[PDB]
Motif scaffolding. Structure first.
Motif, PDB file in Angstrom:
ATOM      1  N   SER B  54      83.513  61.573  88.670  1.00  0.00           N
ATOM      2  CA  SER B  54      84.618  62.268  87.964  1.00  0.00           C
ATOM      3  C   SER B  54      84.378  63.783  87.937  1.00  0.00           C
ATOM      4  O   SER B  54      85.327  64.581  87.808  1.00  0.00           O
ATOM      5  CB  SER B  54      84.762  61.773  86.534  1.00  0.00           C
ATOM      6  OG  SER B  54      83.537  61.985  85.798  1.00  0.00           O
ATOM      7  N   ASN B  59      87.376  64.554  93.501  1.00  0.00           N
ATOM      8  CA  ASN B  59      88.282  64.130  92.450  1.00  0.00           C
ATOM      9  C   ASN B  59      89.139  65.289  91.937  1.00  0.00           C
ATOM     10  O   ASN B  59      89.758  65.161  90.879  1.00  0.00           O
ATOM     11  CB  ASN B  59      87.481  63.533  91.278  1.00  0.00           C
ATOM     12  CG  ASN B  59      88.372  62.812  90.255  1.00  0.00           C
ATOM     13  OD1 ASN B  59      89.217  61.997  90.618  1.00  0.00           O
ATOM     14  ND2 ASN B  59      88.193  63.140  88.973  1.00  0.00           N
ATOM     15  N   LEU B 164      83.990  62.482  79.880  1.00  0.00           N
ATOM     16  CA  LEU B 164      84.924  61.369  80.120  1.00  0.00           C
ATOM     17  C   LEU B 164      84.120  60.079  80.178  1.00  0.00           C
ATOM     18  O   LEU B 164      83.425  59.791  81.165  1.00  0.00           O
ATOM     19  CB  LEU B 164      85.661  61.613  81.420  1.00  0.00           C
ATOM     20  CG  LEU B 164      86.574  62.845  81.508  1.00  0.00           C
ATOM     21  CD1 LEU B 164      87.108  63.053  82.938  1.00  0.00           C
ATOM     22  CD2 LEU B 164      87.770  62.731  80.531  1.00  0.00           C
ATOM     23  N   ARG B 198      93.242  73.878  86.752  1.00  0.00           N
ATOM     24  CA  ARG B 198      94.687  73.891  86.966  1.00  0.00           C
ATOM     25  C   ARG B 198      95.394  74.275  85.679  1.00  0.00           C
ATOM     26  O   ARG B 198      94.843  74.157  84.577  1.00  0.00           O
ATOM     27  CB  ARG B 198      95.244  72.547  87.454  1.00  0.00           C
ATOM     28  CG  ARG B 198      94.939  72.252  88.889  1.00  0.00           C
ATOM     29  CD  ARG B 198      93.712  71.348  89.045  1.00  0.00           C
ATOM     30  NE  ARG B 198      94.134  69.949  88.964  1.00  0.00           N
ATOM     31  CZ  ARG B 198      94.609  69.279  90.017  1.00  0.00           C
ATOM     32  NH1 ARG B 198      94.707  69.903  91.184  1.00  0.00           N
ATOM     33  NH2 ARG B 198      95.008  68.008  89.911  1.00  0.00           N
ATOM     34  N   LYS B 199      96.639  74.716  85.838  1.00  0.00           N
ATOM     35  CA  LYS B 199      97.469  75.007  84.681  1.00  0.00           C
ATOM     36  C   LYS B 199      97.690  73.680  83.949  1.00  0.00           C
ATOM     37  O   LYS B 199      98.133  72.704  84.569  1.00  0.00           O
ATOM     38  CB  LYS B 199      98.828  75.561  85.118  1.00  0.00           C
ATOM     39  CG  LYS B 199      99.609  76.335  84.048  1.00  0.00           C
ATOM     40  CD  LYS B 199     100.984  76.665  84.544  1.00  0.00           C
ATOM     41  CE  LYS B 199     101.892  76.076  83.406  1.00  0.00           C
ATOM     42  NZ  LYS B 199     103.333  75.935  83.862  1.00  0.00           N
ATOM     43  N   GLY B 200      97.361  73.628  82.655  1.00  0.00           N
ATOM     44  CA  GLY B 200      97.729  72.475  81.839  1.00  0.00           C
ATOM     45  C   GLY B 200      96.914  71.201  81.978  1.00  0.00           C
ATOM     46  O   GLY B 200      97.471  70.103  81.791  1.00  0.00           O
ATOM     47  N   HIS B 201      95.618  71.298  82.313  1.00  0.00           N
ATOM     48  CA  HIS B 201      94.791  70.103  82.493  1.00  0.00           C
ATOM     49  C   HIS B 201      93.469  70.190  81.727  1.00  0.00           C
ATOM     50  O   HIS B 201      92.396  69.939  82.285  1.00  0.00           O
ATOM     51  CB  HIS B 201      94.505  69.838  83.957  1.00  0.00           C
ATOM     52  CG  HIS B 201      95.670  69.274  84.709  1.00  0.00           C
ATOM     53  ND1 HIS B 201      95.891  69.543  86.045  1.00  0.00           N
ATOM     54  CD2 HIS B 201      96.681  68.465  84.311  1.00  0.00           C
ATOM     55  CE1 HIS B 201      96.984  68.914  86.439  1.00  0.00           C
ATOM     56  NE2 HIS B 201      97.485  68.256  85.406  1.00  0.00           N
ATOM     57  N   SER B 202      93.526  70.381  80.412  1.00  0.00           N
ATOM     58  CA  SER B 202      92.315  70.480  79.603  1.00  0.00           C
ATOM     59  C   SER B 202      92.026  69.151  78.909  1.00  0.00           C
ATOM     60  O   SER B 202      92.952  68.431  78.506  1.00  0.00           O
ATOM     61  CB  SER B 202      92.498  71.587  78.545  1.00  0.00           C
ATOM     62  OG  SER B 202      91.555  71.496  77.506  1.00  0.00           O
ATOM     63  N   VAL B 203      90.731  68.865  78.699  1.00  0.00           N
ATOM     64  CA  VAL B 203      90.321  67.675  77.958  1.00  0.00           C
ATOM     65  C   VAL B 203      90.842  67.724  76.549  1.00  0.00           C
ATOM     66  O   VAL B 203      91.006  66.666  75.889  1.00  0.00           O
ATOM     67  CB  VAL B 203      88.773  67.521  77.988  1.00  0.00           C
ATOM     68  CG1 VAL B 203      88.101  68.623  77.136  1.00  0.00           C
ATOM     69  CG2 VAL B 203      88.329  66.096  77.503  1.00  0.00           C
ATOM     70  N   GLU B 205      93.772  68.271  75.687  1.00  0.00           N
ATOM     71  CA  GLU B 205      95.093  67.625  75.659  1.00  0.00           C
ATOM     72  C   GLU B 205      95.097  66.248  76.292  1.00  0.00           C
ATOM     73  O   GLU B 205      96.188  65.652  76.457  1.00  0.00           O
ATOM     74  CB  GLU B 205      96.125  68.487  76.394  1.00  0.00           C
ATOM     75  CG  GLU B 205      96.009  69.974  76.183  1.00  0.00           C
ATOM     76  CD  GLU B 205      96.913  70.444  75.085  1.00  0.00           C
ATOM     77  OE1 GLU B 205      97.079  69.690  74.091  1.00  0.00           O
ATOM     78  OE2 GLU B 205      97.493  71.545  75.239  1.00  0.00           O
ATOM     79  N   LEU B 206      93.923  65.708  76.615  1.00  0.00           N
ATOM     80  CA  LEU B 206      93.863  64.360  77.152  1.00  0.00           C
ATOM     81  C   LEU B 206      94.202  63.353  76.063  1.00  0.00           C
ATOM     82  O   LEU B 206      93.607  63.342  74.978  1.00  0.00           O
ATOM     83  CB  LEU B 206      92.473  64.053  77.743  1.00  0.00           C
ATOM     84  CG  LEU B 206      92.282  62.648  78.295  1.00  0.00           C
ATOM     85  CD1 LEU B 206      93.263  62.394  79.478  1.00  0.00           C
ATOM     86  CD2 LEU B 206      90.796  62.403  78.766  1.00  0.00           C
ATOM     87  N   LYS B 207      95.154  62.479  76.349  1.00  0.00           N
ATOM     88  CA  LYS B 207      95.563  61.460  75.404  1.00  0.00           C
ATOM     89  C   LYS B 207      95.127  60.108  75.934  1.00  0.00           C
ATOM     90  O   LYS B 207      94.739  59.981  77.102  1.00  0.00           O
ATOM     91  CB  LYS B 207      97.107  61.438  75.227  1.00  0.00           C
ATOM     92  CG  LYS B 207      97.734  62.779  74.829  1.00  0.00           C
ATOM     93  CD  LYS B 207      97.535  63.118  73.408  1.00  0.00           C
ATOM     94  CE  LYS B 207      98.436  64.346  73.004  1.00  0.00           C
ATOM     95  NZ  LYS B 207      98.012  65.616  73.672  1.00  0.00           N
ATOM     96  N   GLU B 208      95.264  59.075  75.097  1.00  0.00           N
ATOM     97  CA  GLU B 208      95.022  57.719  75.569  1.00  0.00           C
ATOM     98  C   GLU B 208      96.037  56.751  74.983  1.00  0.00           C
ATOM     99  O   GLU B 208      96.356  56.825  73.795  1.00  0.00           O
ATOM    100  CB  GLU B 208      93.636  57.204  75.216  1.00  0.00           C
ATOM    101  CG  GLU B 208      93.213  57.328  73.839  1.00  0.00           C
ATOM    102  CD  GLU B 208      91.843  56.678  73.677  1.00  0.00           C
ATOM    103  OE1 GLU B 208      91.708  55.460  73.975  1.00  0.00           O
ATOM    104  OE2 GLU B 208      90.886  57.404  73.362  1.00  0.00           O
ATOM    105  N   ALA B 209      96.512  55.829  75.822  1.00  0.00           N
ATOM    106  CA  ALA B 209      97.514  54.831  75.446  1.00  0.00           C
ATOM    107  C   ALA B 209      96.844  53.483  75.196  1.00  0.00           C
ATOM    108  O   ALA B 209      96.072  52.999  76.035  1.00  0.00           O
ATOM    109  CB  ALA B 209      98.586  54.679  76.532  1.00  0.00           C
ATOM    110  N   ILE B 219      99.715  56.176  71.181  1.00  0.00           N
ATOM    111  CA  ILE B 219      99.016  57.228  71.910  1.00  0.00           C
ATOM    112  C   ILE B 219      98.256  58.104  70.924  1.00  0.00           C
ATOM    113  O   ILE B 219      98.824  58.554  69.926  1.00  0.00           O
ATOM    114  CB  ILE B 219     100.014  58.016  72.755  1.00  0.00           C
ATOM    115  CG1 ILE B 219     100.613  57.030  73.781  1.00  0.00           C
ATOM    116  CG2 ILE B 219      99.337  59.199  73.437  1.00  0.00           C
ATOM    117  CD1 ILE B 219     101.701  57.629  74.586  1.00  0.00           C
TER     118      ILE B 219
END
Ligand SMILES: [Mg+2]
Lengths: 87, 254
Positions: B54, B59, B164, B198-203, B205-209, B219
């Motif tokens: 990861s 990846n 992760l 990348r724009k908008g890919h931070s841990v 803001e990582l969610k989980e369902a 969520i």
């Protein structure tokens, strides 16, 4: 209850998620039916019941995510980019 | 190949050392006040680097590169500690000792490159519970070896990782983290969250369902159950020295 990391994206205008909702851990045994329910849900698009299809690198998702990984020689460490399209 | 090409590792060590030199100096100047001058103490620091895939560029993650840059910055800052021993562990599906506490110090570019050679970010799982079990066991035996001839020994594990892990493991880690604290091992998790990735890919803001008993998805933010008591978020390398010094100043010392 293993999880897979997915990033949702779309090319359709009216159906974008806020950037803060595009990265999601999901159960690894989920299929397109379950992914569509997540996208339609209150915390996501809140569109109720639009049936969505999903493309991974230009090819439609036809199995669970874990079987997609296994078929392509990938582990649960892989982030999958799922493009959603109206069914 | 299981190793990086040695030449590539040498170039990386040299490039990273130059890139991080001022940051290392700032960290070491702060560490000098926290850890030196002012008992006759000894320090043992294990830098535990995530070797899982990861982390990897394949990846489309920059976490591995940021972790190795951070490793060079921190290892170089720490070599100013007279009474300090620095070791390195790699981990994914299993844990390996990349550099022992007893091995030659990182004053040499060849020794640093030999460590970087071992990190390729290809392992198929991220077994943080095994990492913690091995780290506690490693320090316990180092404590026993310490007995030989009077040491006020302090032990620190710094985990360099994208953070992760399977959500299920968050619970299983808590008993091991208690055990570490009871044995006075301070564990700091340094989350690699490279802001230029990348724009908008931070841990953050990582969610989980999760699907509920009714079947409705619910969520949550992934980090809400992250169990580590001391952790830092690294968006840019420039973030690391002050934050790591602040945590140690407050909670290694106290
Ligand atoms: Mg991993």
């Amino acid at each position: 209850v293993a999880q897979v990391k997915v990033i949702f994206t779309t090319t359709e205008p009216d159906l974008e998620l806020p950037e803060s909702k595009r990265q999601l851990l999901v159960p690894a045994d989920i299929r397109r039916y379950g992914l569509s329910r997540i996208l339609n849900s209150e915390s996501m698009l809140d569109t109720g019941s639009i049936p969505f299809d999903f493309l991974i690198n230009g090819s439609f998702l036809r199995s669970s995510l874990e079987d997609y990984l296994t078929s392509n020689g990938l582990s649960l460490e892989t982030t999958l980019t799922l493009q959603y399209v109206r069914s | 190949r299981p190793l990086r090409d040695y030449g590539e590792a040498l170039e990386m060590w040299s490039t990273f050392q130059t890139k991080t030199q001022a940051l290392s100096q700032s960290l070491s100047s702060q560490l000098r006040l926290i850890l030196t001058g002012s008992s006759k103490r000894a320090y043992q620091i294990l830098l535990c680097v995530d070797d899982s895939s990861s982390m990897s560029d394949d990846n489309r993650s920059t976490a591995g590169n940021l972790a190795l840059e951070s490793l060079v910055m921190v290892a170089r800052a720490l070599t100013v500690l007279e009474a300090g021993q620095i070791g390195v562990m790699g981990f994914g599906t299993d844990v390996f000792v990349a550099h022992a506490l007893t091995d030659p110090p990182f004053t040499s570019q060849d020794a640093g490159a030999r460590v970087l050679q071992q990190f390729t970010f290809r392992q198929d799982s991220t077994d943080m519970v095994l990492l913690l079990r091995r780290t506690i066991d490693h320090f316990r035996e180092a404590r026993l070896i310490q007995a030989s001839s009077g040491e006020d020994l302090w032990q620190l594990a710094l985990i360099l990782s994208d953070g992760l892990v399977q959500s299920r493991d968050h619970a299983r880690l808590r008993p091991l983290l208690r055990e570490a604290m009871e044995q006075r091992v301070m564990v700091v998790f340094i989350v690699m969250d490279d802001a230029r990735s990348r724009k908008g890919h931070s841990v953050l803001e990582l969610k989980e369902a999760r699907f509920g008993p009714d079947g409705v998805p619910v969520i949550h933010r992934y980090l809400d159950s992250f169990p580590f008591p001391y952790y830092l978020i690294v968006h840019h390398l420039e973030d690391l020295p002050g934050a790591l010094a602040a945590l140690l100043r407050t909670w290694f010392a106290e």
